[PDB]
Design a protein around this ligand. Structure first.
Ligand SMILES: N[C@@H](CCC(=O)N[C@@H](CSC1C([N+](=O)[O-])=CC([N+](=O)[O-])C=C1[N+](=O)[O-])C(=O)NCC(=O)O)C(=O)O
Ligand SMILES: N[C@@H](CCC(=O)N[C@@H](CS[C@H]1C([N+](=O)[O-])=C[C@@H]([N+](=O)[O-])C=C1[N+](=O)[O-])C(=O)NCC(=O)O)C(=O)O
Lengths: 217, 217
């Protein structure tokens, strides 16, 4: 079958695990483990990093037949074209492009705060930024069921992931944005997703490696 | 015409400026200025950030009639679809997807170093990593004329950009990689690109904003 390689953490791979399940893909995962302090051994991965035939070795990676992919975004796009989950019109392609990129920005901001020493120091004023962030997602979605338009597309997986994580970090961040709470419920409600969330393969936490100062266990 | 907005710096908008030129697009630019230390005034931009009808306001932005786009990669993809500068087969689409994302990673690494107050003590370690990055690109391109195949695509613009920047940072980083030097020479040899490089509109440095520790002047 297909192989998905990544750390045994949620990280930036929730989107991909969710889509593999949504599309009924025949897959197996390799979940590499990092060592505990002081050093935090990464050898399980390092030992084969440069032996997989990957062009730009990294985690996550996807092996599908003779195809070998890296870059989480690229994996998502690959799967999308494979299972017809892309925007159909120009308006839909545009919305998809922006959200994909925007999610990435929001993800990096989070990691930056969380992989900061005085994690506790910032959270305050960081929770300060959440509303305007959420408001932008809210207004962009509006009354549509999915982010690109009339059908579910790969970007809803990305948007589900980030809205979920901010929801973890700041549990009240969504009270002011009902269409966002409804979108989380609608996504969580897709048949194949619901079933996966009760499964043994489900890995909602931790999000970051023991390394961070939040969701690190 | 089309309107492109961004800082009066190279930053991450070079690929867009180059593609606008390559496609013979009618466009105008707004090059926003930042004040120097210690406050580094951003009002020129802050004064209209929320007044352009953008969904997730940011720099760069592209306004094209009714269409308003943010996120540098979505701006690139929009120009590529309009101008048929995308891959035509699954193989080309994969290679483009990988490269678009790899670029961003390598770009982010440069920035993290360049905005670090510890730049000078930091630099030696960064320098050590250059050869490995360059090798990956070299081996990926191989004997192909362009990154995604036998034809120029929008990813050549991003690759060009990042390889040039690393070459500026460390002049000898391409010596070991002839195919890389040749790619730089070939890209710069395109009729609309040589022409632009001599125009009043060309901006190659400063690379970063005034906050930076290098190429910030
Ligand atoms: N993911 C976005 C990130 C865009 C972004 O962060 N824009 C920055 C400038 S880019 C910045 C940069 N610079 O300006 O010197 C250069 C850079 N680079 O060389 O790669 C990276 C930057 N960055 O902050 O990410 C900005 O000031 N936005 C306006 C706002 O927040 O109100 C994109 O690709 O467009
Ligand atoms: N742009 C690449 C980034 C891949 C990357 O940096 N991979 C990290 C893990 S992701 C890391 C992360 N984490 O592992 O907890 C979580 C994260 N996130 O939650 O957003 C971001 C990560 N990061 O370092 O960028 C890694 O360990 N690569 C193997 C190597 O360097 O040899 C992609 O989208 O796939």
């Amino acid at each position: 079958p297909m192989i998905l390689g990544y750390w045994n953490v949620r990280g930036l791979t929730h989107p991909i695990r969710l889509l593999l399940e949504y599309t009924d893909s025949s897959y197996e995962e390799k979940r590499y483990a990092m060592g505990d302090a002081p050093d935090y051994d990464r050898s399980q991965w390092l030992n084969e990093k440069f032996k997989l035939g990957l062009d730009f070795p990294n985690l996550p990676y996807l092996i599908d037949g003779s195809r070998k992919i890296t870059q989480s975004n690229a994996i998502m796009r690959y799967l999308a074209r494979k299972h017809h989950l892309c925007g159909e019109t120009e308006e839909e392609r545009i919305r998809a492009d922006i959200v994909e990129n925007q999610v990435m920005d929001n993800r990096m901001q989070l990691i930056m705060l969380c992989y900061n020493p005085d994690f506790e120091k910032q959270k305050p004023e960081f929770l300060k930024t959440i509303p305007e962030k959420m408001k932008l997602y809210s207004e962009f979605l509006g009354k549509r069921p999915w982010f690109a338009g009339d059908k579910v597309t790969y970007v809803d997986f990305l948007a589900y992931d980030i809205l979920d994580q901010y929801h973890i970090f700041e549990p009240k961040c969504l009270d002011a944005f009902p269409n966002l709470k409804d979108f989380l419920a609608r996504f969580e409600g897709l048949k194949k997703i619901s079933a996966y969330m009760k499964s043994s393969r489900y890995l909602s936490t931790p999000i970051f490696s023991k390394l961070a100062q939040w969701s690190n266990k």
